[PDB]
């Protein structure tokens, strides 16, 4: 109805919008951290699988 409560809802959704824009960037940084933890476990497992496929034959 009146413009005061519309103005307060605009301020509330703007204060939600700033931190959702921040936590997108937080999710980017934790995705890159989980990518460097993804890249480190592979040369164990390829050497184990090559040793297993040699020993089974």
């Amino acid at each position: 109805a009146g413009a005061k409560e519309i103005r307060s809802k605009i301020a509330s959704i703007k204060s939600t919008q700033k931190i959702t824009n921040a936590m997108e960037k937080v999710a980017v940084s934790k995705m890159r951290k989980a990518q460097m933890r993804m890249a480190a476990g592979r040369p164990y497992a390829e050497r184990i699988r090559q040793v297993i496929g040699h020993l089974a034959n």
């Binding site: 933890r37 480190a40 476990g41 040369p43 164990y44 497992a45 050497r47 184990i48 040793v51 020993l55």
Partner: protein, 128 residues
């Protein structure tokens, strides 16, 4: 004469570099590796593993078990994050059996999975 050696854990890396001489605790006795050694696969008990270089003749890394694999141009130590014995591993198996939360003894053949899942799948595309 130098041979490349890796000590690679299942989560990360511990060592990568050229060496000359490696002493490790094997499954029968303490053994050592030179370049040009025979191919070899052996289980390892927990302890310090000693690696020798020019100047770095006492490069010591503590390894809690795992396996060793020798190629005459390549040494691969595949290590362990924790000591693998049955008194540590059986307690983790018992804690994994005990923490299975069972609230209702369902038959498994219910239809209600898809009745929630199709509604929640159609609700997600109204947001994007």
């Amino acid at each position: 004469i130098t041979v490349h050696c890796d000590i690679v854990s299942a989560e990360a890396e511990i060592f990568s570099g050229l060496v000359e001489m490696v002493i490790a605790h094997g499954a029968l006795g303490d053994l050592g590796i030179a370049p040009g050694h025979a191919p070899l696969i052996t289980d390892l008990k927990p302890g310090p593993i000693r690696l020798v270089k020019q100047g770095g003749e006492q490069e010591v890394y503590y390894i809690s078990g795992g396996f060793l694999e020798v190629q005459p141009n390549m040494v691969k130590v595949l290590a362990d994050t924790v000591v693998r014995a049955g008194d540590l591993d059986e307690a983790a198996a018992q804690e994994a059996l005990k923490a299975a939360e069972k609230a209702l003894q369902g038959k498994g053949a219910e239809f209600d999975y898809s009745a929630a899942a199709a509604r929640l799948a159609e609700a997600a595309a109204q947001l994007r």
